[PDB]
Amino acid sequence: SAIENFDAHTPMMQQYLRLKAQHPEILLFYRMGDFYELFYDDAKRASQLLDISLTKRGASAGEPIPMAGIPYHAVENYLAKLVNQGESVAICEQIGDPATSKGPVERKVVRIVTPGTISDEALLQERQDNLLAAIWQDSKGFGYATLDISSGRFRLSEPADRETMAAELQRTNPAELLYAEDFAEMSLIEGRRGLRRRPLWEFEIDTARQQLNLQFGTRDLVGFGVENAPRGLCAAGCLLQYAKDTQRTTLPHIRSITMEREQDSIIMDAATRRNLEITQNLAGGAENTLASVLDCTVTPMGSRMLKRWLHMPVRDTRVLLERQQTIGALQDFTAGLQPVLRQVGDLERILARLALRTARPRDLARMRHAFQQLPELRAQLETVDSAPVQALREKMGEFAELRDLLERAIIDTPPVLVRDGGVIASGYNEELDEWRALADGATDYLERLEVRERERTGLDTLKVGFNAVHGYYIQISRGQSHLAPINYMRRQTLKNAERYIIPELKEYEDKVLTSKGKALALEKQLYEELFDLLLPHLEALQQSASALAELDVLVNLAERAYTLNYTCPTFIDKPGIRITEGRHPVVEQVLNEPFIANPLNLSPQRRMLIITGPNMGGKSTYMRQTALIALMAYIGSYVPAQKVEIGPIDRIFTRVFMVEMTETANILHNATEYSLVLMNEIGRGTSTYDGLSLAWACAENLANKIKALTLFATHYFELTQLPEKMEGVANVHLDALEHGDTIAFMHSVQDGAASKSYGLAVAALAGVPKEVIKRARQKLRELESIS
Amino acid sequence: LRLKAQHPEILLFYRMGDFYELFYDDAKRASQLLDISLTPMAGIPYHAVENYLAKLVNQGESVAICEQERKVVRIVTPGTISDEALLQERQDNLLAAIWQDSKGFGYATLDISSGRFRLSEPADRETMAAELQRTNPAELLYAEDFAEMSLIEGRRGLRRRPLWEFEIDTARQQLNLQFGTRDLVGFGVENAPRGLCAAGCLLQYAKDTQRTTLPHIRSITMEREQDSIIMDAATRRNLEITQNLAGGAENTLASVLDCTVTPMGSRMLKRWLHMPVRDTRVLLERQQTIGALQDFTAGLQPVLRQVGDLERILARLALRTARPRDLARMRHAFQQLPELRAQLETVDSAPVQALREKMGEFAELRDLLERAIIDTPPVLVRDGGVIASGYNEELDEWRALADGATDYLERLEVRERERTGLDTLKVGFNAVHGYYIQISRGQSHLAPINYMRRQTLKNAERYIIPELKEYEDKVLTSKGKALALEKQLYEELFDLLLPHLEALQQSASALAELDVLVNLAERAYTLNYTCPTFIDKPGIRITEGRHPVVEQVLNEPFIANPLNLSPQRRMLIITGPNMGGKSTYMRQTALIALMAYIGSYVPAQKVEIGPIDRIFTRVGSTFMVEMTETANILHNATEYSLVLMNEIGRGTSTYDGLSLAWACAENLANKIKALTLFATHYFELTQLPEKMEGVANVHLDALEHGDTIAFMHSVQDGAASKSYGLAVAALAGVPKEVIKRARQKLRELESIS
DNA sequence: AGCTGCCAGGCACCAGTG
DNA sequence: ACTGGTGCTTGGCAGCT
Ligand SMILES: Nc1ncnc2c1ncn2[C@@H]1O[C@H](COP(=O)(O)OP(=O)(O)O)[C@@H](O)[C@H]1O
């Protein structure tokens, strides 16, 4: 309706609309003195989201402007509300001085708070990573980049197909996801939280390289091993531009980037991560997962590292051997190291706020406290004989000098904010504790002026006091007020009292507030100056936090191994899995009855097992424990068995309609002889035998061509004939015994096909009427007479 | 501390500042329930406390409120709230009590707002389980010696009660007292002891939560098994009646049938959907109404909408908690009745005219509320400005006095301003100082000497003078007497309205049902439904039937299908692809039966249908679950049952599964004789019709064209003669060579039989 | 311990007097 | 153009009880 041309707007709205256009789709907090305000649809939304009153800002020429707002000092509680809902918010501040500005004071968006770029402790989860990610798709593949803005961890990868792209998204589970406007495979990302559509130009390869190299201080990206990963570079370039625009400061903690090559780790598809319940159970909870058993780390950063390891098993033999050695060597040390490591806390995220220059007084306080743990940690670790632990000990560093700085600079228990001062300890700066000496030391004066004037006037109600609004005063009761000296200058009247000012008290008032201002400005400048002193050491600090997190992980793994009775696995050259008395690491902890340990023997000659046995026999658990044991071995952990020898695993596949078949094909197209394939219940055709026929042909392809290590749980008794027909296939089964009426589930794996199929017995157990089980048994004997 | 001891299993909201606060386990729990920070301590903003009580009670938590020294002044329990803010408009909220004899079960539910009070005596566990699912109580009372804890243990709002709260003699005495009856014969529950024990407990608990008479609870009804189509939880969930498999409400039967215009209508329609009645007399009557009201829905619905949730408004009347906009909405509802009475006048239908009469008019009550209350009264009566001028002479007098006093002060402002020549001069008001004369700081030194200064502001001075305080008393005493008067006249409205509560409850009930029937009429017109007919023996004959939801939700053409079931053609074996077409065909059969049996029109060109005692589905250890559901069908289905089964036998060996499907089919066809759609992949089962009377084959087929396959949804006679797994494997990308081997294997496996 | 309402500091608005 | 009063969010807290 109203024509909103430039000249139709007040200078305020011209300024505002100009800043708002700079972020058309996200809420804009617009600083107006003591309030952050919103206008138009921002006001309406904010009013709905934050439960604040929708009001109006009058207009002489035009429509009234919808309006909402909150006091500047309350902004964090509200940012919490918004980012907790996936909402970005641009934060706009007053840069200019109102007193020296004819028009509206200069304003700027200084920061944009988005779900994947938060670094404030209030807004994060301690034991969970919170990543920003960018995704890109061209004609022949995907590019993908993640950034942990709190740690600087910057990763790049190029999933070759849709299936690995999906798996990658599920693993990294970004809180915010930037995607190019021309992204075609939307089914992969639509309905993820934190979606952000971006213009194609943010993905341009040349700017990506220019910007990254600028960020890293490099001439090219060769040394980062990403110089030839253009798909990935396009996503990384977009991600980095987003990070810079949201923070609008230097990001010195983002100092390198690393490519995630497929050969470096065990690739797990979407269904495997979920079926193994690694960090999430099948109902979306965190209870009864692999992490819930293994993660007894003591620092938040360690908890997160462990979870990353578990989702990303490494295939580097030397790394694994080194972690294994570390776990052995530290086992008798865990009790003493853990209480100390605990006191280090989340050094990694504190350092993020250091690099971002947003660190608050308690952040530095906690940084100090961590530094104070280092010598003790150094002392405990000197004794331990193993190279890797000494490597970590060196990397942990010591920062006695920085520790001393923080001990001299900041009081024992600082306030939350530096905004009001009382953060910089006395003795640190001669000028400061001398402004305080004024602003504060002369508060004795008020007390004595009171008794002096009270005795001099003889008015016993006389009190000296202070009021933010009216300033310092001498107060007399209304009853006595007619008796006051005539050079008492009335300052403030109340119902039952009069308040006055005299020249002496007025001078003190200017003295106090001038020097109070001095102290606080100078204190803020000293606090900022601590950033200048700490920052030069950022790189060694991050190394330290990294060392400390890895120590937390390895120490915890040593304690788990001991307490849960785990063994060190050994690595063989050829594909294979030899397990003696293996257990399911989660199920054995959950069950309140004994877990039946089981063997496994897989080799290039015995590479596929057809697993039979009843429903509830333990086929699924057996297949899962196999993959968990492999996974654990490949993060350097000890494993829940009496002994394990394991060859290399390139990838773990899981398959347990169009969807079954499409997943099956994916195995058939991508599995290799180094793959572990776990399969169940495949073969749901439309008739009696079409499904089973596909299962048979798919198995044959896995046994004869692909040659993957394959555990194939099935109830199709026809498939127990496979070993007869093709090389590399053998039968095993989960033992069960029938005692008259019932069926006993032994949970023990035995060579050979099951003696029989127990569909009828399991049906009976479920309660199917006995007359019907009886007629079914009669039908079964007919079918079995074909043999 | 000590106040928490009074109520141990109830969260304590502790009044402390501008907030309430919970500590320890209460802070722990509250934080994980309300997405709120845990410092142990947690806080709630006073302005939005009701927004939190609603969330906590929705999750089954009672909340105790400890105001100001201090004591528990308010308690809300999930099953006994009646405030609008705490309820959801279109969902019933029930209190239930559950009891187990060394004989059978006892169950009772109460809608505390409508007063709808139901009793039943489920005979076995499954039936009791079904009852819980259907009724989904927000709060559930149970005896301490309750044996079948597995029925209830997972539920929200569990309330463990002493066994003595479940005694027959005191339950009777209490129930009789409540109803003002000598015995319960007139309610048809006099000899339903187990039911009565449950109702006894429930009613005591509800009385205890309110500490008020509950006059709107004047009746109780027994639910007998032969009265409705029984559905177990799986069947209920599988039919996505009001809840879809996801847990939501989109793409459900209600989501398509429910375009009612009042919240009470929506809630009542939903009860109907979950309780199909077997009494054709009621159905015929509902059908006739839907037919007679077809042409009228257009004019009726805008009017019915204005009636609103008169049902929950009347609860607040009965509990004496009704607020002014509650009375104005009742007024508004009253103002619709003559128009509704006039529209329904010509409708030649005895059920419609019964509704018209039972709807009433209350012209005297309408007129009262028009004279008593202003057009749009404030939310609370607390601050007055509720009672309309002209209603009470005395009231008008106190307001006129208050008004002359305030006019004088307005004129005082003017007189004092002109007289002093200070253009900032104003008269104002606040609590601390009452009436005052304000002058800006810059002018305050020109204040006239008679001005007594009382309050300095940053940029203004405030003064009093005798004249100001004189008319202050005038304003305040009159305005005081007027406010006290409003409150009495307001209470008096409850006294004049309450005697008509019974009639008023019948009226909101009539109005609710009209919303439902009129809506079903519009539905039947808009979605091209037809009126089913009822036959005496089991049978289901459908001409061109469709699935009520699929046809609306999916923007593809829906393919309609016949069905012919009778005692001579009791079971259909259904082969061919199951890519949704078999399941849909089976579910639409159930849904059509359900709709017929709530009196709705149904989506077909013609439906004749016999009596149905129960509808079972087994569609969509998995095998262990499927067999457990199969078992329940085989133990409980009769020849009046509709049994729908998909592909049992999956999840075990070919031969065990076939043997089980075969034996199950035989038992259904020959022993039970239920009307059964038996969907299967077993081609071997298509041999049943030769060996067995009353069984026949039908199948779905597909068509292969272009670079795809079109899965037809047309049900045709005979067994399927193709399988499609290989065609699917190929579309899905399974390598050509692999499918070729599968083809050879397939022929080899099939040709043996 | 309340409960009421001023104030915070931006900018625009408006009515009077140039 | 000046002058000097008004208004608008929410949270802290003085100034009354
Ligand atoms: N090795 C074992 N020892 C003891 N109990 C087991 C073992 N393996 C499985 N179970 C238990 O038996 C149940 C059936 O196991 P599952 O693997 O689901 O059976 P299947 O997949 O063969 O039907 C599981 O709930 C599990 O708790």
mmCIF file of all heavy atoms in Angstrom, chain B residues 123-145:
data_model
loop_
_atom_site.group_PDB
_atom_site.id
_atom_site.type_symbol
_atom_site.label_atom_id
_atom_site.label_comp_id
_atom_site.label_asym_id
_atom_site.label_seq_id
_atom_site.Cartn_x
_atom_site.Cartn_y
_atom_site.Cartn_z
ATOM 1 N N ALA B 123 -13.371 -57.840 30.120
ATOM 2 C CA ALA B 123 -13.325 -59.218 30.613
ATOM 3 C C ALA B 123 -11.921 -59.800 30.676
ATOM 4 O O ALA B 123 -11.615 -60.618 31.546
ATOM 5 C CB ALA B 123 -14.224 -60.113 29.769
ATOM 6 N N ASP B 124 -11.070 -59.384 29.749
ATOM 7 C CA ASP B 124 -9.742 -59.969 29.638
ATOM 8 C C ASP B 124 -8.697 -58.890 29.423
ATOM 9 O O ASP B 124 -9.030 -57.716 29.285
ATOM 10 C CB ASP B 124 -9.707 -60.996 28.503
ATOM 11 C CG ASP B 124 -10.097 -60.395 27.160
ATOM 12 O OD1 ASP B 124 -9.476 -59.392 26.753
ATOM 13 O OD2 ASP B 124 -11.017 -60.932 26.505
ATOM 14 N N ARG B 125 -7.434 -59.295 29.390
ATOM 15 C CA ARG B 125 -6.322 -58.355 29.284
ATOM 16 C C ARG B 125 -6.343 -57.554 27.983
ATOM 17 O O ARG B 125 -6.261 -56.327 27.998
ATOM 18 C CB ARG B 125 -4.994 -59.096 29.406
ATOM 19 C CG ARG B 125 -3.792 -58.190 29.583
ATOM 20 C CD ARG B 125 -2.503 -58.997 29.559
ATOM 21 N NE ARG B 125 -1.379 -58.257 30.120
ATOM 22 C CZ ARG B 125 -0.712 -57.307 29.474
ATOM 23 N NH1 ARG B 125 -1.064 -56.971 28.239
ATOM 24 N NH2 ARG B 125 0.300 -56.690 30.066
ATOM 25 N N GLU B 126 -6.452 -58.252 26.860
ATOM 26 C CA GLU B 126 -6.400 -57.599 25.557
ATOM 27 C C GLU B 126 -7.460 -56.514 25.453
ATOM 28 O O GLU B 126 -7.176 -55.388 25.049
ATOM 29 C CB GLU B 126 -6.578 -58.613 24.421
ATOM 30 C CG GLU B 126 -5.340 -59.436 24.102
ATOM 31 C CD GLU B 126 -5.373 -60.820 24.730
ATOM 32 O OE1 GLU B 126 -5.798 -60.932 25.902
ATOM 33 O OE2 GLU B 126 -4.970 -61.795 24.050
ATOM 34 N N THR B 127 -8.688 -56.871 25.811
ATOM 35 C CA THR B 127 -9.802 -55.937 25.785
ATOM 36 C C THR B 127 -9.520 -54.720 26.663
ATOM 37 O O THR B 127 -9.841 -53.593 26.290
ATOM 38 C CB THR B 127 -11.110 -56.615 26.229
ATOM 39 O OG1 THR B 127 -11.560 -57.496 25.194
ATOM 40 C CG2 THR B 127 -12.185 -55.573 26.498
ATOM 41 N N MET B 128 -8.913 -54.948 27.824
ATOM 42 C CA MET B 128 -8.559 -53.852 28.725
ATOM 43 C C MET B 128 -7.503 -52.987 28.052
ATOM 44 O O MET B 128 -7.558 -51.760 28.115
ATOM 45 C CB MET B 128 -8.043 -54.387 30.066
ATOM 46 C CG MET B 128 -7.632 -53.313 31.095
ATOM 47 S SD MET B 128 -9.041 -52.414 31.765
ATOM 48 C CE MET B 128 -8.970 -50.886 30.830
ATOM 49 N N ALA B 129 -6.548 -53.641 27.398
ATOM 50 C CA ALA B 129 -5.491 -52.954 26.666
ATOM 51 C C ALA B 129 -6.071 -52.089 25.555
ATOM 52 O O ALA B 129 -5.646 -50.951 25.357
ATOM 53 C CB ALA B 129 -4.497 -53.969 26.089
ATOM 54 N N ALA B 130 -7.038 -52.636 24.826
ATOM 55 C CA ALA B 130 -7.715 -51.879 23.782
ATOM 56 C C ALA B 130 -8.384 -50.634 24.380
ATOM 57 O O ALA B 130 -8.205 -49.511 23.893
ATOM 58 C CB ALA B 130 -8.733 -52.761 23.052
ATOM 59 N N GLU B 131 -9.133 -50.834 25.459
ATOM 60 C CA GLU B 131 -9.787 -49.722 26.152
ATOM 61 C C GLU B 131 -8.810 -48.600 26.514
ATOM 62 O O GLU B 131 -9.118 -47.425 26.329
ATOM 63 C CB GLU B 131 -10.537 -50.214 27.390
ATOM 64 C CG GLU B 131 -11.929 -50.693 27.085
ATOM 65 C CD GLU B 131 -12.799 -49.565 26.576
ATOM 66 O OE1 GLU B 131 -13.225 -48.723 27.410
ATOM 67 O OE2 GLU B 131 -13.040 -49.516 25.344
ATOM 68 N N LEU B 132 -7.628 -48.948 27.012
ATOM 69 C CA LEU B 132 -6.662 -47.914 27.385
ATOM 70 C C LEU B 132 -6.202 -47.124 26.170
ATOM 71 O O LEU B 132 -6.141 -45.894 26.206
ATOM 72 C CB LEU B 132 -5.459 -48.512 28.108
ATOM 73 C CG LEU B 132 -5.733 -48.924 29.545
ATOM 74 C CD1 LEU B 132 -4.788 -50.074 29.953
ATOM 75 C CD2 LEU B 132 -5.581 -47.730 30.461
ATOM 76 N N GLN B 133 -5.876 -47.845 25.102
ATOM 77 C CA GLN B 133 -5.453 -47.242 23.849
ATOM 78 C C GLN B 133 -6.505 -46.272 23.334
ATOM 79 O O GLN B 133 -6.212 -45.125 22.990
ATOM 80 C CB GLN B 133 -5.245 -48.337 22.801
ATOM 81 C CG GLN B 133 -5.168 -47.821 21.383
ATOM 82 C CD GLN B 133 -3.874 -47.098 21.141
ATOM 83 O OE1 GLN B 133 -3.101 -46.869 22.077
ATOM 84 N NE2 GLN B 133 -3.610 -46.746 19.884
ATOM 85 N N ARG B 134 -7.736 -46.750 23.261
ATOM 86 C CA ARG B 134 -8.811 -45.935 22.726
ATOM 87 C C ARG B 134 -9.013 -44.672 23.563
ATOM 88 O O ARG B 134 -9.054 -43.559 23.038
ATOM 89 C CB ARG B 134 -10.113 -46.736 22.646
ATOM 90 C CG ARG B 134 -11.251 -45.957 22.013
ATOM 91 C CD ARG B 134 -12.542 -46.754 21.960
ATOM 92 N NE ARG B 134 -13.065 -47.090 23.281
ATOM 93 C CZ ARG B 134 -13.725 -46.241 24.064
ATOM 94 N NH1 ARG B 134 -13.926 -44.988 23.678
ATOM 95 N NH2 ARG B 134 -14.171 -46.641 25.249
ATOM 96 N N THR B 135 -9.122 -44.844 24.872
ATOM 97 C CA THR B 135 -9.494 -43.730 25.737
ATOM 98 C C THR B 135 -8.316 -42.808 26.052
ATOM 99 O O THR B 135 -8.497 -41.618 26.281
ATOM 100 C CB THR B 135 -10.186 -44.218 27.022
ATOM 101 O OG1 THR B 135 -9.297 -45.054 27.754
ATOM 102 C CG2 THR B 135 -11.431 -45.019 26.677
ATOM 103 N N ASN B 136 -7.111 -43.364 26.036
ATOM 104 C CA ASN B 136 -5.888 -42.590 26.241
ATOM 105 C C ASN B 136 -5.988 -41.547 27.367
ATOM 106 O O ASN B 136 -5.742 -40.355 27.144
ATOM 107 C CB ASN B 136 -5.455 -41.933 24.928
ATOM 108 C CG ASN B 136 -4.068 -41.324 25.008
ATOM 109 O OD1 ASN B 136 -3.217 -41.789 25.768
ATOM 110 N ND2 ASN B 136 -3.831 -40.279 24.221
ATOM 111 N N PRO B 137 -6.316 -41.999 28.591
ATOM 112 C CA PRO B 137 -6.474 -41.069 29.722
ATOM 113 C C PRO B 137 -5.210 -40.257 29.976
ATOM 114 O O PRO B 137 -4.115 -40.795 29.877
ATOM 115 C CB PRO B 137 -6.731 -41.981 30.925
ATOM 116 C CG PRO B 137 -6.749 -43.405 30.402
ATOM 117 C CD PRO B 137 -6.249 -43.411 29.005
ATOM 118 N N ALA B 138 -5.380 -38.979 30.308
ATOM 119 C CA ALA B 138 -4.275 -38.082 30.616
ATOM 120 C C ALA B 138 -3.737 -38.334 32.017
ATOM 121 O O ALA B 138 -2.618 -37.949 32.332
ATOM 122 C CB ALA B 138 -4.739 -36.629 30.486
ATOM 123 N N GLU B 139 -4.549 -38.975 32.851
ATOM 124 C CA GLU B 139 -4.174 -39.297 34.223
ATOM 125 C C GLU B 139 -4.873 -40.590 34.600
ATOM 126 O O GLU B 139 -6.047 -40.776 34.306
ATOM 127 C CB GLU B 139 -4.600 -38.180 35.188
ATOM 128 C CG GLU B 139 -4.011 -38.270 36.608
ATOM 129 C CD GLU B 139 -4.385 -37.058 37.490
ATOM 130 O OE1 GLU B 139 -5.261 -36.264 37.078
ATOM 131 O OE2 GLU B 139 -3.806 -36.900 38.592
ATOM 132 N N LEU B 140 -4.160 -41.500 35.241
ATOM 133 C CA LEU B 140 -4.729 -42.819 35.459
ATOM 134 C C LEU B 140 -4.568 -43.299 36.889
ATOM 135 O O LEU B 140 -3.459 -43.582 37.332
ATOM 136 C CB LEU B 140 -4.103 -43.831 34.493
ATOM 137 C CG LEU B 140 -4.625 -45.255 34.650
ATOM 138 C CD1 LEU B 140 -6.105 -45.298 34.279
ATOM 139 C CD2 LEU B 140 -3.822 -46.217 33.806
ATOM 140 N N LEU B 141 -5.686 -43.432 37.589
ATOM 141 C CA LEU B 141 -5.676 -43.950 38.954
ATOM 142 C C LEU B 141 -5.711 -45.472 38.902
ATOM 143 O O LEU B 141 -6.465 -46.034 38.108
ATOM 144 C CB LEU B 141 -6.888 -43.430 39.729
ATOM 145 C CG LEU B 141 -7.109 -41.914 39.739
ATOM 146 C CD1 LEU B 141 -8.568 -41.562 40.057
ATOM 147 C CD2 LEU B 141 -6.175 -41.256 40.722
ATOM 148 N N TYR B 142 -4.882 -46.127 39.725
ATOM 149 C CA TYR B 142 -4.868 -47.587 39.837
ATOM 150 C C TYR B 142 -4.669 -48.068 41.280
ATOM 151 O O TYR B 142 -3.990 -47.424 42.074
ATOM 152 C CB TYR B 142 -3.815 -48.219 38.907
ATOM 153 C CG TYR B 142 -2.362 -47.992 39.303
ATOM 154 C CD1 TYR B 142 -1.638 -48.966 39.993
ATOM 155 C CD2 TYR B 142 -1.707 -46.819 38.954
ATOM 156 C CE1 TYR B 142 -0.301 -48.758 40.340
ATOM 157 C CE2 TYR B 142 -0.393 -46.600 39.299
ATOM 158 C CZ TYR B 142 0.312 -47.569 39.986
ATOM 159 O OH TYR B 142 1.626 -47.319 40.314
ATOM 160 N N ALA B 143 -5.279 -49.199 41.611
ATOM 161 C CA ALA B 143 -5.142 -49.784 42.936
ATOM 162 C C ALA B 143 -3.705 -50.258 43.176
ATOM 163 O O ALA B 143 -3.003 -50.644 42.246
ATOM 164 C CB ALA B 143 -6.131 -50.932 43.123
ATOM 165 N N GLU B 144 -3.272 -50.205 44.430
ATOM 166 C CA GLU B 144 -1.914 -50.592 44.799
ATOM 167 C C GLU B 144 -1.636 -52.079 44.564
ATOM 168 O O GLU B 144 -0.504 -52.460 44.270
ATOM 169 C CB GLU B 144 -1.643 -50.225 46.258
ATOM 170 C CG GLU B 144 -2.774 -50.608 47.203
ATOM 171 C CD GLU B 144 -2.465 -50.284 48.655
ATOM 172 O OE1 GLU B 144 -1.341 -49.810 48.932
ATOM 173 O OE2 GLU B 144 -3.346 -50.506 49.517
ATOM 174 N N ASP B 145 -2.666 -52.912 44.688
ATOM 175 C CA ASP B 145 -2.507 -54.356 44.513
ATOM 176 C C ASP B 145 -2.715 -54.781 43.058
ATOM 177 O O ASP B 145 -2.899 -55.964 42.768
ATOM 178 C CB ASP B 145 -3.471 -55.122 45.423
ATOM 179 C CG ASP B 145 -4.917 -55.015 44.967
ATOM 180 O OD1 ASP B 145 -5.230 -54.098 44.181
ATOM 181 O OD2 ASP B 145 -5.741 -55.849 45.394
#
